[PDB]
Amino acid sequence: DDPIGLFVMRPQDGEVTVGGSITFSARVAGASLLKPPVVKWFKGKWVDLSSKVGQHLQLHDSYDRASKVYLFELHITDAQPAFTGGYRCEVSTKDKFDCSNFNLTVHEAM
């Protein structure tokens, strides 16, 4: 892993109620590389985003070259009580490897 800093900013957990929202933000270094960082997300206790990324979970991609950050925004609202996030963000670029582990505790009742 070269001095990329692939994990510029790492998304964190969150405790939310089912019916609210949750928000994650992942900032990945859009440095000079073989090819732009491939950051694969993993959503809550079992999920993927790559498929679901739409209306309740928008896994956005911001692209700041000058910042050298691809900011993948998670706009994930309305966390199902079985959504208890194990969101894993694992980017794999050139030789840089970085990963995050952040949960979403969806509070059904308590």
Swiss-Prot record:
Family statement: Belongs to the immunoglobulin superfamily. MyBP family.
Protein name: Myosin-binding protein C, cardiac-type
Membrane-spanning ranges: none
Function: Thick filament-associated protein located in the crossbridge region of vertebrate striated muscle a bands. In vitro it binds MHC, F-actin and native thin filaments, and modifies the activity of actin-activated myosin ATPase. It may modulate muscle contraction or may play a more structural role.
Modification note: Substrate for phosphorylation by PKA and PKC. Reversible phosphorylation appears to modulate contraction. Polyubiquitinated.
Protein residues bound to Zn(2+): 58, 60, 73, 75
Associated disease: Cardiomyopathy, familial hypertrophic, 4: A hereditary heart disorder characterized by ventricular hypertrophy, which is usually asymmetric and often involves the interventricular septum. The symptoms include dyspnea, syncope, collapse, palpitations, and chest pain. They can be readily provoked by exercise. The disorder has inter- and intrafamilial variability ranging from benign to malignant forms with high risk of cardiac failure and sudden cardiac death.
Domain Ig-like C2-type residue range list: 3-106
Lineage, highest ranks first: Eukaryota, Metazoa, Chordata, Craniata, Vertebrata
Organism: Homo sapiens (Human)
